[PDB]
Amino acid sequence: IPVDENGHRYVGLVNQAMTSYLNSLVQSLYMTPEFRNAMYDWERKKAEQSIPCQLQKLFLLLQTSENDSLETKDLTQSFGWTSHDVQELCRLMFDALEHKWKGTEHEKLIQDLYRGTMEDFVACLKCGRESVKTDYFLDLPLAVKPFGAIHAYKSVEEALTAFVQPELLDGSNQYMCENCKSKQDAHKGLRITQFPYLLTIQLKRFDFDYNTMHRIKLNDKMTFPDVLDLNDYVNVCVGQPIDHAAVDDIVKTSGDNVYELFSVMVHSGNAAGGHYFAYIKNLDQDRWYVFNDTRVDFATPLEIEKSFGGHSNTNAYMLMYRRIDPKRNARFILSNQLPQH
Amino acid sequence: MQIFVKTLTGKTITLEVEPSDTIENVKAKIQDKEGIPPDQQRLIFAGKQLEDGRTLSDYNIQKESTLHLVLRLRG
Ligand SMILES: [Zn+2]
């Protein structure tokens, strides 16, 4: 029987029309300890339309309501909708929170939690001069099939290395070096200088076809572990069972950037339009659950691994990690200490 | 004047644009370079998504900047 850490029965979300991605995004955010606790710290006509207020109400009901399922109609009304992806949805919620939190202590909270830091370099080969500029990133889009590649990347780490791989600019796309005073061959590339606290990584499983002009889904196999070591990026294996603090220390010693998987956004069905659900892990309970619209159940490591790929062709398209820091990693606020009633 | 775009495959291409050009013209040049409809394009710069109607100066996109192209998922 699914139970939360405070002994509360897990609650699903009603699938009104086709909005399974909304449920998966809310259950992921509501699962994020720092993001949920942030929500509780936040404080004639009445403005129900406030996306922060409705998101706060939905989190409160998701935690302290003895009901079968919760309706996201109020949250959709806050958006201003009458009958559209998940990333654009996440941008609308975050920007509405950032706008409401201006002047508040939580003004730069989405930055401190989800923003990463990298640098883009362009090195002209004739001059031998490199131009580096600082750039940030919220999510991390990784490619699956670098077409035409006969073999797609088998693991997330291999996609990460290819993302930070210096690529050569061809004659059609040559770099305009000012010192060269002409178009020139150059090395283009990106390298990560810092990872965000809450690592949001996206898999490019949806590709486009030239002849038919119809999008298609790439069900190629891509693996990801529960523990992620990313210390080599800043200058068969199974991890779905419960974690170990000792293996964390042995990798901690040779590197300080280790992350823990806690949310697995998967998609099943047709490429143009299908169904979305998520395998979510309680960071305080150390247990894997499955959130699928109104139905919330336990999750076995087998069905989480079975979604890597290989042919209803259900595969994960977005993964959520959190940095393993013993002091910064927070826990969900118990219901009793809330000063909001 | 010349900015980079990391397409869906990951291979980065170049584009010639004016700072006064709107983002819709930029997504139109992505169509000429990649054959991808502009309705399906979603451009991300410095983690912030670029919205239609705003120029490149609104986002302070300078020369040699790198935009990220991703597809809109549906369902
Ligand atoms: Zn040069």
Author numbering:
A (entry chain D): 78 to 120, 132 to 171, 178 to 329, 381 to 456, 463 to 492
B (entry chain C): 1 to 75
Cite, word for word, the article reporting this structure.
Ubiquitin-specific protease 47 (USP47), a member of the USP family of deubiquitinating enzymes (DUBs), is involved in diverse cellular processes. The crystal structures of the catalytic domain, in its free and ubiquitin-bound states, reveal that the misaligned catalytic triads, ultimately, become aligned upon ubiquitin-binding, similar to USP7, thereby becoming ready for catalysis. Our study provides molecular details of USP47 regulation, substrate recognition, and the hotspots for drug discovery by targeting USP47.
The crystals diffracted to 3.0 Å resolution, and the structure was solved using the free cUSP47CDC97S described above. The resulting map showed bound Ub, although the two Gly residues were disordered at the C-terminus in Ub. On the other hand, the C-terminus of Ub was bound in the narrow cleft between the Palm and the Thumb, leading to the catalytic site. Leu71 and Leu73 of Ub make extensive hydrophobic contact with Val180, Phe300, Phe302, and Tyr468 of USP47 and the backbone of Arg72 and Leu73 of Ub forms H-bonds with Asp179 of USP47, in addition to the 2:2 salt bridge made between the guanidinium group of Arg72 of Ub and Glu182 of USP47. However, in the Ub-bound structure, the N-terminal region of α1 became helical, putting the Oγ of Ser97 (equivalent to Sγ of the catalytic Cys97) 3.6 Å away from His420 Nδ1, thereby all three catalytic residues in their canonical positions. Both BL1 and BL2 were twisted toward Ub in a concerted manner, with the tip showing significantly larger movements (>8.0 Å). The α5, α6, and Zn shifted by approximately 4–4.5 Å in the Ub-bound structure. Together, Ub binding appears to induce considerable conformational changes in the SL, BL1, BL2, and Fingers, which positions the Ub and realigns the catalytic residues into place for catalysis.
